[PDB]
Amino acid sequence: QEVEQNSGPLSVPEGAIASLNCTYSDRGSQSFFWYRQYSGKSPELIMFIYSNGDKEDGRFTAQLNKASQYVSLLIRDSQPSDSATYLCAVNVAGKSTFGDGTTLTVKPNIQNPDPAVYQLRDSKSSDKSVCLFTDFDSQTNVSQSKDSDVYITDKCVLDMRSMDFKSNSAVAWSNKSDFACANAFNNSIIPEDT
Amino acid sequence: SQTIHQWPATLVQPVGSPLSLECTVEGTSNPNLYWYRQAAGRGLQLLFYSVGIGQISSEVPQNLSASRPQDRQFILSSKKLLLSDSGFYLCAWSETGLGTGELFFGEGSRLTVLEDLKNVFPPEVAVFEPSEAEISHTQKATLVCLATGFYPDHVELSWWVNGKEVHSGVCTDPQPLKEQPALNDSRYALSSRLRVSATFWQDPRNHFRCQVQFYGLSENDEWTQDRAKPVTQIVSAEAWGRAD
Amino acid sequence: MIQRTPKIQVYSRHPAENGKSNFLNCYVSGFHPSDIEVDLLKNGERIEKVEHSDLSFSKDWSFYLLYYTEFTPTEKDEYACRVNHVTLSQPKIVKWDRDM
Amino acid sequence: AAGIGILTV
Amino acid sequence: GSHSMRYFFTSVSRPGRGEPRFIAVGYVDDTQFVRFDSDAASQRMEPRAPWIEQEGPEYWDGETRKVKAHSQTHRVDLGTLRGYYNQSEAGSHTVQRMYGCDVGSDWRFLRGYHQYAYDGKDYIALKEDLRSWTAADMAAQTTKHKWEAAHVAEQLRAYLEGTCVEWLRRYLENGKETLQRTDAPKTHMTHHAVSDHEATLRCWALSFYPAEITLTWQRDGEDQTQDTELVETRPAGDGTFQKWAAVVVPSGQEQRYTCHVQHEGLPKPLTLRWEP
């Protein structure tokens, strides 16, 4: 309540303008910060600002309005790597107090989806295996499994600079007496197995 | 981090254990020092702050203690830990005085406190080889890696290829998934995917290791179980390539 | 460096009313460095219960303190203020003037 | 009492 | 009326017995209202007028944090400056800082300032434009470079033009009773003749606020007189101030001298002849 900051995942498409916002009660607030925090990492300063107006550093633009008591941050032309939690901090009386942070997810979109589901087999023995749902468009999404003796993961973003190819991968597997790759959950029209 | 280093990186400790985290700083002096905490929900909370050597100040009524024998040595600690004290702990420093407020952070000490260590288990790792289809359809090679059954949920998956760590092509899950979704102290799975072009998976001498750092019990920790002590260790799995 | 010898005023808060309570102020100022003994005196014998304003300064960085005690003045009593400071060879004594 | 702008010399 | 708030800091070094004594004090107009003393037990920033005890504990914590930090920068500075002035560890040196806000009758920002002295002499001070720096000497020049690099002016301008003024208004609004009060002076004259031809006249003015005043002796006719005494305005102790202007005249013509008085709490300026 001292420093307010919408949490839940904002999602923006790759290359759009991401906009984060922050609010603060105590009027005598001297300076203002956005830090960025990567999963499992310590936080790290994008920007600070201490008088009304706008301040730009590359793709980042801070906006402060002491009258309205808000600090914004806009990210121009967003990359997938900008997905992070963005903490807002307000230095009053020689102590910066922190928001609970807002979490951003930059969805890539893929120039050309080749959606598909393959079964990858364990190197160490035949019996064990898993299924991979890969190469789909970010518009499509992957849903958690009921009858959970079968485990499916949410999607995970893949960036091989190599050839200009980003893939969207999700994986599912089970101990069950063979239910093979066929679990229907909102995918698109895609190739198959022998 | 060049300017401020902090350790230990990660701790699994049973309730009532002692705690001591250490923090060092180099490259300024008479710095303001700070201990912050990132509890259950990602907001930083100020625990202790210090204006200079031997001067401490507490913000919330606390179980923990902090001290500073030296201009650049900062210690947070505790006699008996509670469940409450789980969290990410961040040492920070700012410029002597009241400058712009800018904060420089340590790399963080992550603390998990447990009621019962008998719950703790390192991960089963397995690497699964790309399908004959994916190479034909797309001339590409996704190798999945699967760490399963570990607990607690901090582990650090890492891809290795002919002796060197590689980042391009990798995708490790943003965080892991309960194996018994409906169960309090369930264990967890986590999946990563390296993807390399067909002509690489075909092996002119090529070697793929999937490797998982697990943070677990430490030496000297009362363990009464028949199985071996699930300490911090690196579990890992392997594959070599294949001209089909 | 600069040292600055202090100015001194000693005086009553309200007009001298013989046998009615009042306060006697010894006011030192315009001086530097800040370390400074000031004693208030009832007929040469020191007065213990004396008070002193927090020290501030002027645009020329010179200090200024207000020492003061509560006192009921009389016809026969001479109060005087005693100041010593690095700038003074010996302690200056300033007798309290009824209407100055 | 200022919050920023107070650095050493 | 025009109104100002100000903070004054002082740090003397006590080599060989303790850390530097540190004393901060704050004013609105001619009225003190907060303080800190490194040697006082409480170790907090303490109140010094009624209308400030109004503020909550969040405030006091804040101002304490702030003041302590000042204390520390001053503790370092004392060290730096020994180096710069090549002085020995023995013996004691002072460092002083002072900044504040003025505002006009409209309560709008008028001018800002922030200055720093060492051993009683100006070291570095911020120009009126809140952007540039004057510096005494090659030591001050070292700092000016350091402070230009770190945009200390830019940060200060923020405070001075922003928050410092905002708070002065807040205080002036809570203080009405005390701060916007304007006590007019109670004045009397006193006739002490040095015998025979001499005669001097003291034109007293007690119980006024604020301290700004102007008392000026006249003849019947032309106004000015250079051959006149007056003492610096002095604190009563109860919140008001005192001043008088003496002048010397013959023991004839006593009543042909009139002492005009100009204060902000007087609608028409006073004037005073000799009584009997």
Residue numbers in the entry:
A (entry chain D): 2 to 195
B (entry chain E): 1 to 244
C (entry chain B): 0 to 99
D (entry chain C): 2 to 10
E (entry chain A): 1 to 276
Paste lines from the article.
The interaction between the clonotypic αβ TCR and peptide–MHC (pMHC) governs T‐cell mediated immunity toward pathogens and cancer, and can lead to acute organ transplant rejection and autoimmune disease. Here, we investigated the Melan‐A (melanoma antigen A)/MART‐1 (melanoma antigen recognized by T‐cells‐1) protein that has been the focus of a number of clinical approaches designed to employ T‐cells for targeting melanoma 16, 17, 18, 19, 20, 21. It has been previously shown that, in the context of HLA‐A*02:01, two overlapping peptides are recognized by CD8+ T cells: the MART‐127‐35 nonapeptide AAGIGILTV (A2‐AAG); and the MART‐126‐35 decapeptide EAAGIGILTV (A2‐EAA) 17, 22. Our data revealed that recognition of A2‐AAG by MEL5, but not other published TCRs, involved a novel peptide anchor residue switch, enabling the peptide to present a bulged form, anchored with Ala1 of the peptide within the MHC B‐pocket. Finally, we reveal an extended mechanism of flexibility at the TCR–pMHC interface that contributes to our understanding of the molecular rules that govern T‐cell antigen recognition.
